[PDB]
Amino acid sequence: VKLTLYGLDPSPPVRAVKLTLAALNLTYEYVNVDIVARAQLSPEYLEKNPQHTVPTLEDDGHYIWDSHAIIAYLVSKYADSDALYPKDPLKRAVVDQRLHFESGVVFANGIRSISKSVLFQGQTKVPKERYDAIIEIYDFVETFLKGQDYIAGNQLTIADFSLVSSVASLEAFVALDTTKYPRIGAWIKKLEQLPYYEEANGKGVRQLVAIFKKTNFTFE
Amino acid sequence: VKLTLYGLDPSPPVRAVKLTLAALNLTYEYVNVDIVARAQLSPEYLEKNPQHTVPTLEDDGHYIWDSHAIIAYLVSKYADSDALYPKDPLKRAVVDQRLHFESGVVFANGIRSISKSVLFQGQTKVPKERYDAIIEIYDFVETFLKGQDYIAGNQLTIADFSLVSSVASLEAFVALDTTKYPRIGAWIKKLEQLPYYEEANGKGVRQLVAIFKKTNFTFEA
Numbered sequence: 001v002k003l004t005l006y007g008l009d010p011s012p013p014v015r016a017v018k019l020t021l022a023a024l025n026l027t028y029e030y031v032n033v034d035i036v037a038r039a040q041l042s043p044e045y046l047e048k049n050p051q052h053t054v055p056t057l058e059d060d061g062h063y064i065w066d067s068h069a070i071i072a073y074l075v076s077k078y079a080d081s082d083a084l085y086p087k088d089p090l091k092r093a094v095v096d097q098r099l100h101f102e103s104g105v106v107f108a109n110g111i112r113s114i115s116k117s118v119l120f121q122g123q124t125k126v127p128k129e130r131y132d133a134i135i136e137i138y139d140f141v142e143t144f145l146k147g148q149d150y151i152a153g154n155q156l157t158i159a160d161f162s163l164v165s166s167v168a169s170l171e172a173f174v175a176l177d178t179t180k181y182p183r184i185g186a187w188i189k190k191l192e193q194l195p196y197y198e199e200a201n202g203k204g205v206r207q208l209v210a211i212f213k214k215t216n217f218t219f220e
Numbered sequence: 221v222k223l224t225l226y227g228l229d230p231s232p233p234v235r236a237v238k239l240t241l242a243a244l245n246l247t248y249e250y251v252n253v254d255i256v257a258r259a260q261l262s263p264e265y266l267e268k269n270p271q272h273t274v275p276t277l278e279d280d281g282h283y284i285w286d287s288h289a290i291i292a293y294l295v296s297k298y299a300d301s302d303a304l305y306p307k308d309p310l311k312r313a314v315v316d317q318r319l320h321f322e323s324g325v326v327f328a329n330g331i332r333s334i335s336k337s338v339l340f341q342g343q344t345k346v347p348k349e350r351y352d353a354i355i356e357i358y359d360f361v362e363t364f365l366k367g368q369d370y371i372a373g374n375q376l377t378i379a380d381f382s383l384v385s386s387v388a389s390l391e392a393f394v395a396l397d398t399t400k401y402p403r404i405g406a407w408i409k410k411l412e413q414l415p416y417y418e419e420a421n422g423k424g425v426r427q428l429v430a431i432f433k434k435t436n437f438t439f440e441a
């Protein structure tokens with residue numbers, strides 16, 4: 001009755017929120033918004049989110065948007081501790097960096113870049129820098145995982161949620177050589193062990209990979 | 221004395237950090253990293269920041285990168301209050317939204333898309349889509365400024381610093397029509413009133429506009 005989440009399961013940033021919600025044991029209502037139908041462009045949605053993105057969170061009449069902002073909000077307001085978003089400045093700085101990296105280098109530049117050409121402008125072949133963008137994403141994330149079980153240190157954080165949500169979706173554009181990237185493979189698999197992963201993230205990953213596999217789209 | 225900032229003045233995210241450092245009246249060493257000469261790819265810097273971006277900040281032997289993580293770190297650790305990065309969760313959620321907006325929508329998609337092409341890979345004309353991303357940026361920020369003086373509520377925050385460093389640099393690509401965009405026009409003017417703005421952001425905004433001028437590069441229609 002308090003929290004309502006807007007979005008759809010193929011969206012990576014929507015799946016970052018689903019995970020965090022599940023992780024905090026917060027009951028919530030889920031309202032679909034059909035992006036394909038352009039439901040986000042309606043002035044009722046606009047009212048909730050001038051930026052017309054998903055996810056949006058409504059809490060008790062307040063609207064919060066941007067998956068990174070939403071999940072930071074959720075932890076800071078509703079967690080029992082700061083385990084998922086530690087308040088120690090150095091630890092926090094690593095988490096914040098990984099979040100901001102997801103927003104820019106991973107999401108806007110790697111996913112949405114491609115998603116707009118294919119899914120919204122029918123475009124059928126894609127420039128090779130779109131390909132190279134992903135490879136560089138894998139390389140960075142492989143490097144970020146050196147010496148540690150989780151993406152921002154030695155404990156699970158919202159940064160794991162944000163980056164797994166999109167990095168796992170990258171399979172849709174370029175499969176993951178797990179022998180070139182054994183740390184990304186282990187990390188994904190360790191998170192797949194979470195009891196809520198399959199519903200929050202797993203199914204929407206596979207859905208997104210199949211939405212793209214159907215476009216038959218090509219690089220270069 | 222304590223802090224060192226690696227970067228160069230024409231870079232929008234370096235200037236978000238410069239603005240913050242100045243607003244907190246923090247002293248720091250400023251080390252030039254020449255990305256034209258690819259100095260970020262040296263062993264030295266890679267060890268400091270594996271993503272090899274500017275800015276990087278060094279504090280007490282620790283390396284923080286990403287302008288947004290840096291400026292949040294600085295306020296949270298050095299400010300006399302949270303005015304620049306309020307802790308109230310609702311107020312925090314707006315500032316954090318704007319910041320992530322800056323990282324993805326403005327910087328990665330608006331600026332580095334072009335800059336990488338035009339300056340590093342010497343391309344001389346760039347797609348219509350890069351023009352439209354920038355119109356879309358201006359429209360958004362115009363709406364975000366509705367009914368308030370600052371980008372994230374009605375107090376100066378690190379969201380102002382982050383977005384002004386980038387939004388002011390967009391003049392390099394598309395000049396700002398203040399008949400369409402009076403709120404942005406006015407938000408920039410109000411930030412220009414800060415005694416520290418000229419050194420922290422204003423000059424480097426002009427150097428970047430100039431560097432892009434010199435490329436004579438063109439948008440496709």
Ligand SMILES: N[C@@H](CCC(=O)N[C@@H](CS)C(=O)NCC(=O)O)C(=O)O
Nearest residue numbers: 011013052053054055066067068103
């Ligand atoms: N980085 C943002 C991205 C939001 C985003 O671009 N979402 C897409 C879905 S993949 C969307 O709503 N697109 C429709 C639109 O922008 O109008 C976040 O983390 O929330």
Ligand SMILES: N[C@@H](CCC(=O)N[C@@H](CS)C(=O)NCC(=O)O)C(=O)O
Nearest residue numbers: 231233272273274275286287288327
């Ligand atoms: N959104 C990031 C942007 C970082 C970034 O891409 N910086 C550029 C300078 S404009 C850079 O270091 N380029 C050199 C490289 O990536 O190798 C931030 O706020 O720190």
